[PDB]
Each structure stands twice: as structure tokens, then as C-alpha cells.
Write an enzyme that holds these catalytic residues in place. Structure first.
Site, mmCIF file in Angstrom:
data_model
loop_
_atom_site.group_PDB
_atom_site.id
_atom_site.type_symbol
_atom_site.label_atom_id
_atom_site.label_comp_id
_atom_site.label_asym_id
_atom_site.label_seq_id
_atom_site.Cartn_x
_atom_site.Cartn_y
_atom_site.Cartn_z
ATOM 1 N NE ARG A 125 -3.686 2.153 2.672
ATOM 2 C CZ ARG A 125 -3.880 2.796 3.822
ATOM 3 N NH1 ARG A 125 -3.217 2.464 4.929
ATOM 4 N NH2 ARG A 125 -4.753 3.799 3.883
ATOM 5 C CG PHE A 184 2.484 4.202 8.430
ATOM 6 C CD1 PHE A 184 1.739 3.600 9.435
ATOM 7 C CD2 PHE A 184 2.678 5.575 8.483
ATOM 8 C CE1 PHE A 184 1.214 4.359 10.462
ATOM 9 C CE2 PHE A 184 2.163 6.330 9.532
ATOM 10 C CZ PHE A 184 1.419 5.715 10.524
ATOM 11 C CG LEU A 186 -1.760 9.445 10.696
ATOM 12 C CD1 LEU A 186 -0.666 8.702 9.925
ATOM 13 C CD2 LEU A 186 -3.121 8.832 10.400
ATOM 14 C CD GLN A 240 -0.390 0.031 5.904
ATOM 15 O OE1 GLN A 240 -0.911 1.113 5.668
ATOM 16 N NE2 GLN A 240 -1.037 -0.970 6.490
ATOM 17 C CG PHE A 274 -0.623 9.478 3.604
ATOM 18 C CD1 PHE A 274 -1.648 8.568 3.398
ATOM 19 C CD2 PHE A 274 -0.321 9.823 4.905
ATOM 20 C CE1 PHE A 274 -2.336 8.032 4.471
ATOM 21 C CE2 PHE A 274 -0.966 9.270 5.991
ATOM 22 C CZ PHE A 274 -1.976 8.356 5.766
ATOM 23 C CG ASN A 295 -3.691 1.259 14.693
ATOM 24 O OD1 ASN A 295 -2.895 1.995 15.293
ATOM 25 N ND2 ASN A 295 -4.835 1.694 14.217
ATOM 26 C CG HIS A 348 -1.534 5.095 13.380
ATOM 27 N ND1 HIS A 348 -1.793 3.851 12.858
ATOM 28 C CD2 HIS A 348 -2.572 5.873 13.000
ATOM 29 C CE1 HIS A 348 -2.930 3.860 12.180
ATOM 30 N NE2 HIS A 348 -3.423 5.090 12.256
#
Length: 364
Positions: A74, A132, A141, A82, A79, A121, A145
């Protein structure tokens, strides 16, 4: 929450681990990460162990607790990137060294810069193996995270990952952690390219030991790298020659940007020669637009460069842009009237134009 550490590493006693990354079956480079064991010892240790694979086989997945071979499944440009799903390779699996899931340890550090390592998560206290790496600040975030490390070498490899072609968020090419592990103190960084060429410099100059303001040292590094590029050129490996010449230009760019005007000028001869050599390689590979673009770059350093005008006209001929080719050769001839190669190439282009126009208007 506390700002993430600016120094690299934040703490000399924190573990360092690495990923050697491949894209489409080709080694792109190594990423070295600091793990913040001084702040999130449990989260750090999970990741450390998954880099070595030392805890063996995961009970819930029946697969090795290990990142080797694991894809980045991903990726979202601007951004994050991951990965870490070693069992299903798609974001639905993986597991931690503590069990299927473990608790959010703390949210001490802010996601306030690129290069931060953080746990993926599916809500509170659902940490597994997936992680990530951010490529921008991601403060939305925070508190959700656990931030637990940072890139300390090879951000540029992470930048290459972020820019791969994707379908939705899945890379078109396989992007994988080809090798991984832990660096012990006194271990070599292992961040020079693994391409057998003897190059002892990091592919990205910010990772090199050298101050980029030290133009004299950058010049000696550039000469070393250029020389390696020429080794490839003389063996007709156009692609690898371009890789090395292109790397000289990254060092030159970083240095000219950090240094004062007059110091930076010292690097132009070596930059020019590498841009010209790249143009030569692109012609060898019939990359006409690439050649044209590299020749422009050369003329942007030396506007009266007849080598670059000549080669650009050759690139224009490949594109069948003969007016452009004619203009470049006429300009080259004015500068260098005794050049026989340029005389002959003008005749050739004039004959090409006539033949093309004749074909376009001919009728039975």
C-alpha cells in the site's frame, strides 16, 4: 506529544536496522532506520526482532516472524508507504512477537516530519507487524498510531518507493524488502550501491559523510563516480553509465545548493561532462526525447556547446522534428565552421526534409 527527534540518530544506544529494497526485481537501495527503544522499548523490540527473524515461526500465521521477502502493499504518494504483512501481503495479516496483537505502548512522539516509522493498526491496541514510513508530516495520526523510529539513511529510497506507479494504492511493480536485519555497533552501514562497481559513496549525497558545502571534496567524489561511469561506458553498458553520471549530478546539485555561488562554479566542468556523457548514452539507446532533454541541460550550462547542439539535432532527427534539427545544426556550424561532422549532418537533415515533404505530397 513531543516533537520527533531532529538528530539522526536521536540516541546512540538505540538499535539500528535496515531494509534492502527491490522494485520490479531490481535493487533500488538500502534504508536504515533508528528504533526508539529509549521511548517505546516494546514496540521497538517487536520491529527489531521482525528484522532479524530471530523469534522463529508465528503461531497465529504459521509463517516466519520476519520481514524478509515482505512487499510494500500500500503506497500513497505524499503520505506514506506501508508494509510488514508477511503472511497475506495485502494488509489483512501479519502478527507481532507478543501475539496476534499488542497494546499501543504510548503516543509520546508526534508524526511531525517525513521519515517517521509508525505502527499500522485497525484501531486501539491492534498492533501486529505492519508499519508505515511517512513521507510528509501526518499529524492527523497523532494519538492513533505509535511512532517508534525514523529513517536515518536512505530517505531517497523511500522517496522512490512513494513515487512508484500504483493501481489504487497497490504498486504495479513488486516493491519488496529483499533483505533485512540489525546493524550492530561497529557494523558497516552497507549503504553504498551493491552493484559490483566499487563505488564507495551513498547513492544520496545527504547520506554521505562529506559536508555538501565542501565543494573541493565533492569535486573529488564526482571525479571518482564519473570515472566509474566511464568504466561502464567503455564496456557499452549505457544504462549503468547513465546511473553513475546521474549520481554525479545528484552530488553536484546538493553541493551547489548548499554552497556559495562562487564555490559552486567549480563543479560546472564535471557536471557538463557528465550531462554530455548521458546524452551520448541516450543516443546509443535510441532514447530520442531523453537525449534532447539532456542536451538542453548541457546547453543550459554552456550555451555554445557544439557537441550538445549536434547531439540534440540527432535526437530531433529520431523524433522526426527536422526543423529543430536544422536549426540546431545551423547554430552549431556558425560556432564551429570547420567542423566536418556538422557540415555533413546539415546535408543529411536537408535531404531528410525534402524526402519527407515529397512523400507527404506525392500522388499516383
Amino acid at each position: 506529544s513531543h516533537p520527533s527527534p531532529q538528530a539522526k540518530p536521536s540516541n546512540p544506544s538505540n538499535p539500528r536496522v535496515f531494509f534492502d529494497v527491490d522494485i520490479g526485481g531490481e535493487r533500488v537501495g538500502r534504508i536504515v532506520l533508528e528504533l526508539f527503544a529509549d521511548i517505546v522499548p516494546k514496540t521497538a523490540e517487536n520491529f527489531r526482532a521482525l528484522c532479524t527473524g530471530e523469534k522463529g515461526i508465528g503461531p497465529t500465521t504459521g509463517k516466519p516472524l520476519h520481514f524478509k521477502g515482505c512487499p510494500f502493499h500500500r503506497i500513497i504518494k505524499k503520505f506514506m508507504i506501508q508494509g510488514g504483512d508477511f503472511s497475506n501481503q495485502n494488509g489483512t495479516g501479519g502478527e507481532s512477537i507478543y501475539g496476534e496483537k499488542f497494546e499501543d505502548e504510548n503516543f509520546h512522539y508526534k508524526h511531525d516530519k517525513e521519515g517517521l516509522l509508525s505502527m499500522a493498526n485497525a484501531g486501539s491496541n491492534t498492533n501486529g507487524s505492519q508499519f508505515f514510513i511517512t513521507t510528509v508530516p501526518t499529524p492527523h495520526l497523532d494519538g492513533k498510531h505509535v511512532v517508534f523510529g525514523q529513517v536515518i539513511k536512505g530517505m531517497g529510497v523511500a522517496k522512490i518507493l512513494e513515487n512508484v506507479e500504483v493501481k489504487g494504492e497497490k504498486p504495479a511493480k513488486l516493491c519488496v524488502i529483499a533483505e533485512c536485519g540489525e546493524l550492530k555497533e561497529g557494523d558497516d552501514w552497507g549503504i553504498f550501491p551493491k552493484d559490483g562497481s566499487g563505488d564507495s559513496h551513498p547513492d544520496f549525497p545527504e547520506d554521505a559523510d562529506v559536508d555538501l558545502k565542501d565543494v573541493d571534496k565533492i569535486l573529488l567524489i564526482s571525479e571518482d563516480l564519473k570515472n566509474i561511469g566511464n568504466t561502464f561506458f567503455k564496456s557499452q553498458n549505457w544504462e549503468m553509465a547513465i546511473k553513475k553520471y546521474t549520481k554525479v549530478l545528484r552530488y553536484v546539485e546538493g553541493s551547489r545548493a548548499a554552497a556559495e555561488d562562487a564555490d559552486g562554479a567549480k563543479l560546472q566542468p564535471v557536471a557538463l561532462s557528465c550531462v554530455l556523457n548521458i546524452g551520448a548514452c541516450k543516443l546509443k539507446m535510441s532514447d530520442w526525447q531523453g537525449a534532447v532533454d539532456s542536451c538542453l541541460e548541457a546547453l543550459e550550462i554552456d550555451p555554445s556547446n557544439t557537441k550538445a547542439l549536434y547531439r540534440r539535432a540527432q535526437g530531433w532527427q529520431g523524433l522526426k522534428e527536422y526543423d529543430q534539427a536544422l536549426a540546431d545544426l545551423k547554430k552549431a556550424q556558425e560556432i564551429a565552421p570547420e567542423d566536418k561532422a556538422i557540415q555533413a549532418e546539415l546535408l543529411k537533415v536537408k535531404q531528410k526534409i525534402k524526402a519527407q515533404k515529397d512523400k507527404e505530397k506525392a500522388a499516383y
